[PDB]
Symmetry: D2
Subunit: 492 residues, 4 copies
């Protein structure tokens, strides 16, 4: 009924008084300082992503410290995400630093280490040791962000494949390689990830964006890598090839959330198919009640120009229409010229798309898929959201300690803000990747367990009033405990 | 969707574990004694009806006292209803008390008082002074359960009517005269009624069944006759002629419920139209959320025979399928030979019908008629009944002091028992006219104010446990303060 | 949504311009003559039932001849039904013609033939030879329309059961017996049925009401009994005990329709359960698209009184509310005092109930149960009926040779008349047991095959105009071929 | 329910066997020759667009002739569209042709004609005489794709405006000046347009893409300029500014379809609001049952690069998800380097998106918006599409001379191909702007009038067979005469 809803809109009408979608910003040279982080917060950042593909621990420690200091000064809670380098397949080095590959030529790719330092156009190293048992004649090998394509012809021997060069491209040392038709069986985490995951645990990071996740079992290996002290850290799986797409259900089941990495998927999969995989993965997460992030190539052209292209604008709005909880900036904020303006524009686009989006369609499609009998939690949250639509309540207040009930309510897509009142700061930070929720910390050790829930409910209603969401005479729907209890409150 | 539900039924499956419909019994000489009342209660009586058309205040006082004593000895709460004589048009006296009226033969009816004694087969008497100025040229005067018809030709004078006798009836003193195309404008209540109603209030009756209600304003007259001390007594309007049916919407709005008096309706409305009027009135009260009683000609042949006719049984079951809260016995218990057996048989027909009735169709049809936005009470009660269906809960517990919210929940027809926990014994008795509710009295003088609700909630739950409605690991939906809080509780 | 529909009705509104339900009348002494059949036709009979439990072939031949002659004179098509005697279990004879059975007494029921002529209260014959292998100790034996109840105690020997008499009742010779807890395994048809079925085939009867149908296999035995020349005769199965109820699905599947024989069911099954089995069997037939007849004890009291009881009126309306195609009169027309008036009253009751009945509920419940993909026939008829609701068309015209497409359209319950145009008179007669259809004979041998369907469609539209169903500017929905073709016609 | 459909998809399943969306290509010097046009057709072009902003009548005549010749050699019918230059506000001439405008610096714009030649950086010229009396104190004058902004301060005189230059732009001769808060009241069509439109009619173009439509009355002006001989030519209104968007309902009602000109909208509406305007306009046309085209900035970067950006691909796919009938290429085919490849890639994105799009949501959303009662045509076409879903039919055949009913069927979005069988070659070409229809020309001069429809029906069915849409035992839904007859045919 989005179609029926479009009929009634006018683009000269006011936008909503709140933005539900959440903006993740990658921190780098343009943005690491406390003042630049403050600008990013004020522009609309909810999450600071650290790309551990680059920078040492010391560099990321400065990110960590500066985010906390910026957030403390503005009086907000900002989530910190550790995005891992992950396992990789790269070529070796070449004699003269470079290899000119020509359409029609035959070359040999080998996994023998002796060729690591001495590659040429005719024969060169690929560091993936299982390369030969996982490829068949006919498969393609992509190298250099998929620009050079080789076709496998035969096994020259146990370690060496004879390949045709399908297209001309010059490659330099240590380029990335992809196998679009094969199951890559590299481990879940690299040796470097293990070191980086431990550091992320020691430094209190909120979530991991775990690279190259291919199967459900690898999620548990990331979890083991985080150790017992890391058990509350969220694992968001980055879906980057066909195996991740194919195994999405069981991956979603084990993960705490999903990243749709469109540019990585796009190396292996036609761009038109990635548009469609983005729709599927996002709807499956919406149905699982798990946050989903739309990432890479979002307003890329605004890295160096003051304005993005019109197609990039439609990409960002369409991620919100698809159902994304979050939209993500990489080089635009890490190294770009206009970090503040890009985040501000991203927020505006999201806000505009949300004003057009019919939330009732998400609520109703999601509710119709529940199997009866529902459990108590599910019944209470979907009813509570139903009660919002039925009374036209203007806010929800959900008391949640771990954040579970807040995410379960957000899953059902009310058409008003959700204020989560929690007794854990780390819940305030982790809910920054859930659309449509804002969190209020209630310090139980300072103020009391509030067993009767009245102080926490008042803290929620007060926050909603300070934002203009509710006034005297409006309804607010309250949920508390996971969450088996609801009230419809008349606001004073 | 009753249709789809019918497909799945087997008459060899066991019946539901609770009976939702309520049985009202008229007390008379067969049934007035404490032992006979106890037999009525154990057989299924929830309400004792006093018919104030017969007997003295002292006689009704004894019914009151004995009902209270029988209920006390059984530990139950039984409602007491006062059914008013109401206004009437009595013919006067005749020659020796008789005449024979025949077809063709000319008759003259009088509004003049001197002819109160001296009547004939020619010219006689009627005490309704508005007779001539209401009855038009050609209308019908029924006199005696509608069995004698007379046709008003012309006004012989101001206080006389010139009449065809249109059939052969042999009548006798002081008759039920019936003016069917005629809007009878006798007042709401007679002098007897005003005196009887005051007695009712003095004696603490739970409800009035107010005879012959024709318009909404007449409901006000009953309420004023009940006065300041009668403000908590329910008024159930007895719909007995075409005007009450025409005016049904405004009558329901002013009243606390309706009795459909099929026999009386039938004096001037063809029987097949009364069957439909019954459907309309029941559905309008189901939507109003007010109790509705199906009365007269229920299991009549069981007054003197040990079993009813097959068409009588279907009448009672269809009353339940139509949506009645209550079915009522008149002579069958007041002066019949099988009072226990007729009540037990009524209870068994009700329970059989209920096991075939799809409550969900009721819930859904009613919910769909709700105006959006809903008020908080409406939204909370529909949602709680919705949650019963979604979680297949096995009981509801409703905290309700006045009974209002118990009735609001019952309106939506959950497919499990409702347990009202109440602090007023009069709410326990008054809810006896609401299908699908059992009330648990919580003695606040003797047990405290239970500000936390927890003692009342547990009393509710324990009652449900003692009846076998719920056991360990079942769900129960709990509602309370109007009613703006809901919980879905796992039974311990 | 019957409940929502009740809210909008008024009993002073005009009834529909057509009666959809069909009245079956049993012919006897009060009604066998041509003038009395003419009166019955004019009063509303569509079907003349012959009860072959009584009368010889010669008697029924007069019924057959007189129905045809009455129908020819009035210019209508009347269906003729042969209702079989069927297999029976009876007691033998008693010494002195009579046996006084007393609560508490022991008696012996035996299947040894030697006792056929010499029964007494202590020991007597029951002609069902498998009696002893089919009963267990604890079972009941009903005798004399279920008035006398025996309980089986033990097997006295291979042929004799020792029984307690549970209640006092005097029985006379050759009384009927029932076994409520046992599977009766008598053959489908008696020796007498076979002779009567052959006669019915020779005389061109339209349908058989086949007595005591217990399982699906017995329907095929009735069919074999009718022989190759009887293959177009409809078999309507009379459902009279628990086995028929239990096996209803597979019976419906093989039968051409169902009779719900409430009084026979009521011998074995509590009357409250029979109310419910009537609902189930009728809805299952509505879903199967097969006619269903509500029979026995319909307005029984109007056999000797000029008016029926109010409960009997509600029984007839409630059969139409349940979904019956037909309602049936037995002694009321066969031997009663008021045959014309009873049929007229039955028609009026049906008409009144139909005016209140929400046909859209039947259409929508039935449509939602179809499995997708539907076959072409089903899709065309349900769409055609949907198109009636959508355009508010005022009639349907369905060209059907065998009557199959007309019954498939009637199954979907349009809210307008259906005019079936058929090239077989016997289809005109057989459709008399399908609600909501009237048939027009088109003699193809006289007028042409009408391959372009225009003359048959005009014959339908003309009939609809002559009845007042449609006028200039109204829509009429036309279906033709079973039936894979639809048009929405503007009436000229 | 798009949401539920997303859950079931796999990007590794095969694509649909037909592409429903239609591809429009702008002809220019890369593409004008018969061979290049043939390459366009085989690559997926259904419509040749002539941009009458450039080139002479002789030049467009050659496009016309070559399109017809290329289509004839391939045996297909291709639509020809004339896109009008439309009215404009050109700045005049300058000093040497240039100036540099900077921030702060004062500028004076003139409506006086003597300054047509002699302009400066100070004071220059604009040919829109209503300039001063439309533009208010403080409004914006954009001049050059919106890149130069100027702010109107006050009226320096009657025919002059006193202006802040609010940025640094260095402009040049005869510019696209843009008055964004301004309701531009230039007439509907210029003199060039009236001359070009008459040429269009003489040359038998199928449709007009009418530039810069702002109001409904303006549609009349186009139609009058087309005159009596142009009455069958479709008018597609190009929506290019805020007024066309404000007035969208009445414009659609008067027009035969809409083009959403994103680039032009974007001059005065922020890009994120144009994304939403696109959603609104497409849905309003889907409900109107009129073709809607998504145009400008489609795969722009593919004008000179061998591949588009990833955000461009998503733009095209989302155009299809929004519901567009047609996507349009401008410079990409008019002067680009890869005209064949851009069309083939467009076709592949369209087909990918379609395989993910749930047509049923469209069908259902549209059906629900229909007013009851429906007219016969509406009811027949929705029902026929409903029958496709119910029987999982694999094709529709629609007989439609003018194309009206083909478009009415397409509106309801069956999930199978529609084959229109038509007697007019111009209906074959005009339906090229309606998604999901292929047209089969039935030559009535050469083949007869087919009064029985049977030859046209079989031509439809055979075409569907030759494309592999249906084989033996599939269903096909056939609709014909407006369209008031339907058949569900089993394929032989
Ligand atoms: O390969 S090493 O760099 O020596 C290395 C060091 C450590 S460490 O001592 O804990 O730091 C590892 C800890 C845990 C590992 C697990 S597990 O999740 O703990 O079960 C699985 C695999 S596997 O390679 O996928 O089979 C591991 C491979 C290599 C590991 C470790 C693995
Ligand atoms: O028992 S008799 O009276 O001698 C007698 C006479 C004839 S008749 O020659 O055709 O008239 C029978 C014809 C067909 C019969 C069939 S069947 O449907 O044809 O298969 C079944 C049974 S059964 O008893 O259920 O096994 C029959 C029982 C007794 C029959 C006939 C039966």
């Amino acid at each position: 009924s989005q179609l029926a809803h479009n009929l009634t809109l006018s683009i000269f009408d006011p936008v909503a008084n709140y933005r539900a979608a959440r903006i993740i910003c990658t921190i780098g040279p343009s943005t690491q300082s406390v003042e630049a982080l403050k600008g990013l917060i004020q522009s609309g950042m909810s999450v600071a992503r650290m790309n551990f593909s680059h920078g040492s621990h010391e560099y990321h420690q400065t990110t960590i410290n500066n985010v906390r200091q910026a957030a403390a000064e503005l009086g907000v809670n900002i989530a910190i995400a550790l995005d891992t380098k992950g396992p990789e397949i790269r070529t070796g080095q070449f004699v003269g630093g470079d290899a000119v590959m020509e359409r029609g030529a035959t070359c040999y790719v080998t996994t023998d280490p002796a060729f690591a330092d001495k590659g040429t156009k005719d024969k060169f190293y690929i560091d993936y040791q299982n390369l030969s048992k996982v490829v068949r004649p006919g498969n393609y090998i992509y190298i250099d962000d998929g620009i050079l394509i080789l076709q496998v012809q035969s096994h020259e021997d146990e370690q060496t494949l004879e390949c045709t060069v399908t297209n001309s491209h010059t490659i330099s040392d240590r380029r990335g390689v992809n196998l679009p038709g094969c199951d890559v069986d590299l481990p879940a985490v690299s040796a470097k990830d293990r070191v980086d995951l431990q550091f992320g645990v020691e430094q209190g990071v909120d979530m991991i964006f775990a690279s190259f996740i291919r199967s459900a079992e690898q999620v548990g290996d990331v979890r083991k890598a985080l150790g017992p002290k890391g058990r509350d850290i969220m694992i968001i799986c980055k879906i980057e090839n066909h195996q991740g797409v194919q195994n999405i259900d069981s991956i979603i089941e084990e993960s705490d959330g999903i990243m749709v990495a469109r540019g990585d998927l796009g190396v292996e999969i036609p761009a038109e198919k990635v548009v469609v995989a983005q729709k599927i993965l996002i709807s499956k997460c919406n149905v699982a009640g798990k946050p989903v992030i739309c990432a890479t190539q979002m307003l890329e052209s605004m890295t160096y120009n003051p304005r993005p292209t019109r197609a990039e604008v439609s990409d960002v709005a369409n991620a919100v229409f698809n159902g994304a909880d979050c939209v993500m900036l990489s080089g635009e904020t890490a190294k770009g010229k206009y970090p503040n303006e890009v985040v501000q524009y991203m927020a505006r686009i999201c806000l505009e798309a949300q004003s057009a989006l019919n939330e009732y369609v998400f609520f109703n499609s999601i509710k119709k898929l529940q199997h009866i009998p529902m459990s108590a939690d599910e019944a209470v949250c979907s009813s509570a959201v139903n009660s919002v639509y039925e009374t036209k309540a203007k806010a929800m207040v959900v008391l949640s300690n771990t954040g579970r009930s807040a995410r379960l309510v957000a899953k059902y897509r009310p058409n008003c803000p959700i204020v989560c009142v929690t007794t854990r700061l780390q819940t305030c930070r982790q809910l920054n990747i859930t659309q449509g929720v804002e969190s209020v910390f209630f310090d139980a050790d300072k103020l009391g367990h509030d067993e009767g829930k009245e102080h926490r409910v008042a803290a929620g209603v007060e926050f909603a009033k300070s934002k203009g969401y509710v006034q005297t005479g409006d309804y607010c729907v309250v949920i508390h405990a996971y969450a088996n209890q609801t009230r419809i409150l008349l606001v004073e």
